[PDB]
UniProtKB/Swiss-Prot annotation, chain C:
Belongs to the universal ribosomal protein uL3 family. This is Large ribosomal subunit protein uL3. Component of the large ribosomal subunit. Interacts with DHX33. There is a cross-link at K38, K223, K225, K285, K365, K385, K392 (Glycyl lysine isopeptide (Lys-Gly) (interchain with G-Cter in SUMO2)). Component of the large ribosomal subunit. The ribosome is a large ribonucleoprotein complex responsible for the synthesis of proteins in the cell. Gene3D superfamilies: 3.30.1430.10, Ribosomal protein L3, domain 3, Translation factors. The keyword Transmembrane does not apply.
Length: 60, 153, 394
RNA sequence: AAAUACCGGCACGAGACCGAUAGUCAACAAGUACCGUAAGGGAAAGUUGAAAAGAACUUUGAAGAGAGAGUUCAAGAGGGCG
RNA sequence: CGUGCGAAUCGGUCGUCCGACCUGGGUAUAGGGGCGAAAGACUAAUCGAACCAUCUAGUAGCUGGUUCCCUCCAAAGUUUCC
RNA sequence: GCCGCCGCAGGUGCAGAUCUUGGUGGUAGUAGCAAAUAUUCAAACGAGAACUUUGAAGGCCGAAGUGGAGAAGGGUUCCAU
RNA sequence: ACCUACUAUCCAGCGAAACCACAGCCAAGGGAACGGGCUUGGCGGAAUCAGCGGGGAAAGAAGACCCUGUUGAGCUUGACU
RNA sequence: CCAAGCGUUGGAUUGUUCACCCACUAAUAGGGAACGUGAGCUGGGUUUAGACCGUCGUGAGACAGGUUAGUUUUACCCUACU
């Protein structure tokens, strides 16, 4: 429904930009009702969010 | 309150009203005078044609800056547009009037609209900014609508 | 004040009503006058422009600088389908105008003629001319046509025959025929009526109507372009770069004391889709249509006296957005008014054509038939394959 | 000290003065709101019903917005309502 | 563009760019006065004498307007002077 | 709440004054929603999604940025329901 | 002479300003000595859309030119005090 | 004479109206439209102030005597045209 708050909090936890962040689009209503950072750490321990890798720059 | 047209018979006829609608006065009056003298099923089919952009409303009095079209050749006029928002509000008004006829205990297919009127309303106040610091208005033109249904076989 | 460095104008006065015309077919304004000295023939004919190509011919005229030499010119192709006659119509000479009396139709009216009356050919149940054809199998219907033969003898002077083009031979998308009135030059009224009764529901040939090397008139409709400006239509002098409010407009239109404006100054408006009439076009060759006897087809149209081959006028890969010319064709001088797939009216000459330049038999030498699409350099497929040899998957 | 002056203030009375664009600019949470960097400038604005008896009850509709009822002498007084 | 994004903006386009280079904060200079590489140039969207209040309802042989009815009488563009 | 009659008094009679305030029209559904490249599909709470959400693809700003932080200035503009 | 983009045109939603004695088919005559309105002669037969600038002595500002008023300001001199 | 049907150029200079020259042709004839003509263009010179030289005025200034650069707004309303 609205994940602009959780994207900013995920960027603040992972200590990078919000561009290289991949959320889990399966259960949006189950992920969105967290309301705390302990649930965010629980989702990180479960392994739903993924830090997206850096776009490559081939020096060959 | 005192109305414009008194009903001939309170048993057969019925009335309904709509107040403070954000629609244009000219377009609302033109679609009201267009839909004033038809059957209710033909009116719903005409609203489906307006929604699908199949039959437009000709503009005979307020004829300025409107391109010509072939779909208004049924009425006998060149200009024509589709008042979609006014059409949706009058569709809700005919639905409310059909519910009023159902509350009165009236027949469905025999209802014919007889009278409809578009009266003025107090206008809102907003503005926009232009060059050299001169305030120019951006005012609307709302309207009040009343309509009468009557069973005629 | 007057103009110091004078220049009259840039424009035409004979064509100043530049409006889109209601008529579609090019109508003959001035018909040829009949006389008993001429035999029975037709005045005008209706055809369709097909293409355009080169020509090789021999010039022979006295006193010119170029004499007994070979030149090339641009020649047209006008496909001339035969027409079906659906009757005649009379016209009585009144002091008010030229009024008709009675329209006589044929018995077997063609479906291409019936398509003109109906707007939707699929939805209609074909109810026209159902009780009118009941006059052909009874005595009461034939007595009405016999009494009209003597009534039109006294008063009706001009008798125009009604024809329509045969679209069945053409493979085009349209199927609707164009009706046309053609005045008959010939003998008396009785001979004209007998010739019309004999030629009722008959095919109209091209060679009996128009012949060789006659300076004929061409009537056609200009191809439309759209709403264009005064510079695009009249082609006047343009304004230089230093102008502020545009440089492709008319600068001075009126003045102070002529407070109104007239049509003397060139104005903008509708360009294209207008009626025109071209004159003095020389006929070179009346081509022959396709015919098949005993299997072997005959298509010797591009085969001139010096061609020493046997092939048609169809180029390599067909025509450009036209189709194929299945019927017979004629070949004229210059360029006619109109475009591709546009109707065209051929008309006999009104003025007595007696000129030294326009009276010469044209020796047909060579007709260039190559692919105008791209860069064609071959006449026929067997010559191109003889030049190119084998291919990859032969 | 005596009879002389009073336009501001402390308590009133009276009027051939005016009556909501009038009368003090301001009859109401008026030098108040507001504008200008500042000395400064300076507004708009009364009349429900005697009495709130301010509309319970049914239906359309997501709600807005309608259609029947009730009060009272009258809604011909419907929450910006002489 | 020119009833603008703008009560003075943008594109092509330049003069200059280690020295007569631009300038962030505090302070001095105010109106027949100040400042001024000198243009009555500038001094808060206003500078051949800044803004506001008072005298002031200053003066005007000069323009603009100045509101019911009915009846009777019925004009001059000049003599002389400043 | 008001009229006539006998005397008296006036801030007592409007069509204008580029008159004052307020209200309303033709215009007119006209002109207009163009300074700076670019978005396209699946699902979703919700009656309702060219503009909002996530997932994917294609790009722009190119370290003198369409980046992060300060001072003047603004004064809850920060966050939750 | 030709092409692209931004335009302009039509549809959904929204939606001004200027101007306004009243309206805008003509020629001749006269006039405050150049009128759409007066007279005489020609004509005029619903309603709108995209251009154009000939006219509306098109809007602007009690003319920025000249003169006068027993109207004001600055400079300057051996005018006067 | 009938007679305005159809025709009556290019370039060096001058801001130039006007005027001069060259080459050519058929003639290179003469004019009006509110000094035809800016909500049709152009500002070269006049025609806002800035400066130069020469004359006159003691003095602020004046020179049919010049030089040089000097901000051009809007039709979408009606008629007429297409
Ligand atoms: Mg080709
Ligand atoms: Mg020249």
């Amino acid at each position: 429904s609205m994940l602009r708050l959780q994207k900013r909090l995920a960027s603040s936890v992972l200590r990078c930009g919000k561009k290289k962040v991949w959320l889990d689009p399966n259960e949006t209503n189950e992920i969105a009702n967290a309301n705390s950072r302990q649930q965010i750490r629980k989702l990180i321990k479960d392994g739903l969010i993924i830090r997206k890798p850096v776009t490559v720059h081939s020096r060959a | 309150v005192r109305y414009s047209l008194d009903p001939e018979n309170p048993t057969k006829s019925c009335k309904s009203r709509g107040s403070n609608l954000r629609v244009h006065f000219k377009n609302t009056r033109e679609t009201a005078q267009a839909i004033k003298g038809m059957h209710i099923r033909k009116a719903t089919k005409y609203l489906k044609d307006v929604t699908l952009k199949k039959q437009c409303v000709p503009f005979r009095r307020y004829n300025g800056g409107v391109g010509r079209c072939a779909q208004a050749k049924q009425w006998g006029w060149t200009q024509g547009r589709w008042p979609k928002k006014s059409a949706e509000f009058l569709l809700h008004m005919l639905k409310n009037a059909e519910s009023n006829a159902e509350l009165k205990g009236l027949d469905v297919d025999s209802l014919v609209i007889e009278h409809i009127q578009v009266n003025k309303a107090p206008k809102m106040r907003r503005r926009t900014y232009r060059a050299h610091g001169r305030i120019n208005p951006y005012m609307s033109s709302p309207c009040h609508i009343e309509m009468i249904l009557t069973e005629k076989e | 004040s007057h103009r110091k460095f004078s220049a009259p104008r840039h424009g035409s006065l004979g064509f100043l009503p530049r409006k889109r015309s209601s008529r579609h077919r090019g109508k003959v304004k001035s018909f040829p006058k009949d006389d008993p000295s001429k035999p029975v023939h037709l005045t005008a004919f209706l055809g369709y422009k097909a293409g355009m190509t080169h020509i090789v011919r021999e010039v022979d005229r006295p006193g010119s600088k170029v004499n007994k030499k070979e030149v090339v010119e641009a020649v047209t192709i006008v496909e001339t389908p035969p027409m079906v006659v659906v009757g005649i119509v009379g016209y009585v000479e009144t002091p008010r105008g030229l009024r008709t009396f009675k329209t006589v139709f044929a018995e077997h009216i063609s479906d291409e003629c019936k398509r003109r009356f109906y707007k939707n050919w699929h939805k209609s149940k074909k109810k026209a001319f159902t009780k009118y054809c009941k006059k052909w199998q009874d005595d009461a219907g034939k007595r009405q046509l016999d009494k009209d033969f003597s009534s039109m003898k006294k008063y009706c002077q001009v008798i125009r025959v009604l024809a329509h083009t045969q679209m069945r031979l053409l493979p085009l998308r349209q199927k609707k025929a164009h009706l046309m009135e053609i005045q008959v030059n010939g003998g008396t009224v009785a001979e004209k009526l007998d010739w019309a009764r004999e030629r009722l529901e008959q095919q109209v040939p091209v060679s009996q109507v128009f012949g060789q090397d006659e300076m004929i008139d061409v009537i056609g409709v200009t191809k439309g372009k759209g709403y264009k400006g005064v510079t695009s239509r009249w082609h006047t002098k343009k304004l230089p770069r230093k102008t502020h409010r545009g440089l492709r407009k008319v600068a001075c239109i009126g003045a102070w004391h002529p407070a109104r404006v007239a049509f003397s100054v060139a104005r903008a408006g509708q360009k294209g889709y207008h009626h025109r009439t071209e004159i003095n076009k020389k006929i070179y060759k009346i081509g022959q249509g396709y015919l098949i006897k005993d299997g072997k087809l005959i298509k010797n149209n591009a085969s001139t006296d010096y061609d020493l081959s046997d092939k048609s006028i169809n180029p390599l890969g067909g025509f450009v957005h036209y189709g194929e010319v299945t019927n017979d064709f004629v070949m004229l001088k210059g360029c006619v008014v109109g475009t591709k797939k546009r109707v065209l009216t051929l008309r006999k000459s009104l003025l007595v054509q007696t000129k030294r330049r326009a009276l010469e038999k044209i020796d047909l030498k060579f007709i260039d038939t190559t692919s105008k699409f791209g860069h064609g350099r071959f006449q026929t497929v067997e010559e191109k394959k003889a030049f190119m040899g084998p291919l990859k998957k032969d």
